[PDB]
Ligand binder design. Structure first.
Ligand SMILES: NC(=O)c1ccc[n+]([C@@H]2O[C@H](COP(=O)([O-])OP(=O)(O)OC[C@H]3O[C@@H](n4cnc5c(N)ncnc54)[C@H](O)[C@@H]3O)[C@@H](O)[C@H]2O)c1
Ligand SMILES: NC(=O)c1ccc[n+]([C@@H]2O[C@H](COP(=O)([O-])OP(=O)(O)OC[C@H]3O[C@@H](n4cnc5c(N)ncnc54)[C@H](O)[C@@H]3O)[C@@H](O)[C@H]2O)c1
Ligand SMILES: NC(=O)c1ccc[n+]([C@@H]2O[C@H](COP(=O)([O-])OP(=O)(O)OC[C@H]3O[C@@H](n4cnc5c(N)ncnc54)[C@H](O)[C@@H]3O)[C@@H](O)[C@H]2O)c1
Ligand SMILES: NC(=O)c1ccc[n+]([C@@H]2O[C@H](COP(=O)([O-])OP(=O)(O)OC[C@H]3O[C@@H](n4cnc5c(N)ncnc54)[C@H](O)[C@@H]3O)[C@@H](O)[C@H]2O)c1
Lengths: 267, 267, 267, 267
């Protein structure tokens, strides 16, 4: 239990990676406040964890919902140690040529309001509390914040924008708050596309050096690491690629050592 | 005259770096179409260059103004070889803690609609023409797309977003259109801040390795290079840091060799 | 005890960061084999940890000493799960202009043989064992592998070379062995300079965003993370900057939020 | 003729990319001194260019040969404006598992002495002249200095080491000398492998976004750009990826827009 007594606020924690994070942080001894728009999924979370979790129904695009989540977390758990802005929506890799002219403006706002402005509002709302606890922020980025072909122009630009948030907020909030970003890979979640615009495992296993798409729980360890003051004190402004090795894949094969057992005579 | 007969479309070309680019590209033999919201400054440009330039008054946030600029450029000059999305607004380095809650939503849209959506709309509007000419796109980024302290969270995230546009559009438009980004530094322009939120040379000379802030005309050579098919054919998805060396400055001094003349006995 | 029953081989583990790593990994339940040239310091380590550690006196530049360390680790502890090539020497930030012509060749070999070839030999020697255990390699890099002014040309080029080892070996050894690199910062160790060429805390606290130079034990958490199969399975080819935020420091100040308590009225 | 009256020194200029560079720089009006070990190829160069070129037979691993090249260039052409360290040898992508134990030490020195130490010696020898002319250094790197699978561990680590030279020497030689690096791609040259260890176009066209391997002359434009004081004054410490887009290639296809003509109805 590395995070006993710590309080953590997670946006988009009712499903997918966010939900795995709530489960992992509770197992590490933390209390977790979650801001999510789905009342039903938040109810499930409260059923499973009881008073180890606090559900706040609200939209990340709303600074007022964000401030309500922060004040309720402070009221219930006394502080906010770690903030994990994670809620997001994908653009279903719609290429530029396939983005319809009539909804490009609306899709731009949907994607950027959720994925980028929602991240800024979480930090703005929790700032006073994070400074008081000398806490930290861990942004969920994705391989889309580093390499192409993880989404179309909208999602790729929005996730690259979060790299800029990591660097600029690591500078601005130092020396009180540490700010780091996790470049997580593909997950079998319920990630939705933009309303404005109306397999993963098998496709990707040939391009990932690790040779398999990780389960959603295998992506929680990096967040625990960055949230641990005793292990991550020198980490601020860090960007951890954590997607199975997409950035080091080969030209013609994902992995270059599929034949290592045979080459070294291991059995 | 490296670009004789080439046609170039520049957004935000009526002032500052954009205007220097128009002057340089005309001097290289190109015809230049400019999309800018300032009627008055566009008039000045037309006075100076005559029919080597074409002024289109319009907003980069409007896909219809962008499409009007592209069709007028094609009508007048027959094609579009190079597109340079460059219009932008700064956030006056307003830190997160100083961004007022009541105008954060509006400032987010002003900054992102101009600096990011305006860049996407320029490419969307000029796509058919760029594919026909096997042309290229050169985005104006800034040191703010790479390092902190070049603006607050809004401008730093928006310029980092353009790095994502470079990578994703270089992939998507290959092999027909090359897409590259220029990380230009500080200029003595008329760069304005957000309406929503209501020296440079002397401050920065101690932190720049080159020891002086470059004149606006010294930043035009990199664009000419990327627009030259005979010199930049292997360049796609490239990001050129071009800001005086901010990224390689030292810990305690901008430059590490201020004493080299004395150390080597040069006079 | 996150690494109970794991076996770890550390080069240069008798002093400084290496020694802190041995202490931390033993505390996490691992058995640790150490390859170091100092017989005396290895004796101290064996005194402190008894049969939780194994000392092998040898030079990292010698492939035969490296192979002896690997076979002794396998003989004693049955396997090798994690390999941490860490031994190194600094160049005392001797700039290019100050490197004497008469010893430049010798200094080049001393620095590169230890810091780079020593890392390749450790992986070559432990390869068969790492493939059998599906283990991982964690290279100690430094801020010198990312930014200037952490050493002169020799040390900066040698540490940047290790970034190339991370990427190329992450590709080549996948999908069996994960390869990651830690960009650790300044430590109060006994790091020596090159024989060929014959404060830290107080100097650096004004340039580090965290505002203090971390103790040597605060740099061990990132290695434990990467060595934990249950937390770092998606991490291969990763480079973690872990130096107090040097890469996100400001232009005129290390940290941009020294006044946050006063600005937010915290007491 | 962008470089009339400029003097340029190129190492490894008698063949492949180096030779194309000599041809291009002479065509731009420069005088070029070349340091190469091949007497025969240097003779050919002198036959083709006459007294626009100066051939110095010598080894880049020898600081004395390097100093002889620099003093002869200064004697003949009066100065040294641009220095282009370019000589190199490949490792034939020999993976770590295939590197023989008995020649690993010798191969390490052959590769690093030529590719890395040869680059340091060129700058050391030409330093006084570069400071006097406020000149610049352009290192030939390669895609191997950025991504895996461009060579084995030795060549990939050596080319990544040159990125460290770019950053550290850009800092140390500022504000007098600009230092930049070109990440050139695959060429149909006579690049040899290590003596110690005893198609390209067709293989790579499916992974390059541009869809073809560039001719050797198409890689010379970036060097001319960086050597032009009037166009590259703000460029120092820059790293230009220039390899056909390897870094932005897709997961399943090199280019993502092979069908753009059909999708946009162009003919
Ligand atoms: N699934 C993938 O392949 C993947 C890959 C990489 C990175 N990511 C990123 O991981 C993060 C989590 O995505 P996920 O896969 O877990 O998706 P998910 O859809 O399962 O989870 C998103 C959660 O955010 C909540 N949410 C969505 N919009 C909201 C809004 N406006 N206000 C409040 N809550 C809102 C949803 O209700 C949901 O509970 C996102 O940032 C996503 O971009 C996902
Ligand atoms: N000035 C600097 O220090 C600096 C530094 C780095 C990068 N940049 C970038 O360089 C680019 C040019 O900025 P600049 O310094 O030349 O500024 P500038 O203000 O002089 O030029 C901006 C031009 O864009 C036009 N413009 C602004 N908003 C518009 C809109 N909505 N629609 C159409 N046209 C619009 C303006 O009328 C003006 O002519 C921008 O992307 C900016 O972010 C500037
Ligand atoms: N001290 C710093 O500021 C610092 C900063 C960043 C990164 N680093 C890196 O951390 C790693 C550890 O350095 P440190 O500070 O702990 O230094 P240190 O001198 O205290 O430890 C180096 C250890 O390596 C052993 N060693 C040296 N040469 C050897 C050889 N040829 N063969 C076998 N063993 C040998 C030494 O005997 C010693 O026990 C190195 O890679 C160094 O580059 C150090
Ligand atoms: N060919 C490729 O695919 C390729 C790809 C990317 C980068 N590069 C790089 O481009 C640069 C030029 O390589 P190239 O393709 O033109 O190869 P090349 O073999 O045709 O040219 C190398 C030149 O260097 C000279 N040389 C070699 N060792 C020398 C030494 N010890 N002293 C003096 N001169 C020496 C050779 O005689 C030759 O004239 C190298 O740095 C190489 O790493 C090559």
């Amino acid at each position: 239990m590395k995070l006993k007594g710590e309080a953590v606020l997670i946006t988009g924690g009712a499903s997918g990676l966010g939900r795995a994070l709530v489960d992992r942080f509770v197992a590490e001894g933390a209390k977790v406040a979650v801001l999510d728009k789905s009342a039903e999924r938040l109810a499930e979370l409260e059923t499973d964890h009881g008073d180890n979790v606090l559900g706040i129904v609200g939209d990340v695009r709303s600074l007022e919902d964000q401030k309500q989540a922060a004040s309720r977390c402070v009221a219930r758990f006394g502080k906010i140690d770690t903030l994990i802005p994670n809620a997001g929506i994908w653009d279903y890799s719609t290429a530029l040529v396939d983005l319809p002219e009539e909804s490009l403006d609306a899709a731009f706002d949907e994607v950027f309001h959720i994925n980028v402005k929602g991240y800024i509002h979480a930090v703005k709302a929790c700032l006073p509390a994070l400074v008081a606890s000398r806490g930290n922020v861990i942004f969920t980025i994705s391989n889309a914040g580093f390499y192409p072909n993880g989404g179309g122009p909208l999602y790729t630009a929005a996730k690259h924008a979060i790299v800029g948030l990591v660097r600029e907020l690591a500078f601005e909030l130092a020396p009180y708050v540490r700010v780091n970003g996790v470049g997580s890979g593909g997950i079998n979640s319920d990630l939705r596309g933009p309303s404005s615009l109306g397999p993963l495992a098998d496709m990707l296993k040939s391009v990932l050096p690790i040779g398999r798409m990780p389960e959603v729980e295998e992506y929680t360890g990096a967040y625990v690491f960055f949230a641990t003051r005793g292990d991550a004190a020198p980490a601020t402004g860090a960007l951890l690629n954590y997607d199975g090795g997409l950035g080091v894949r080969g030209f013609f094969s994902g992995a270059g050592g599929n034949d290592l057992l045979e080459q070294l005579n291991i059995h």
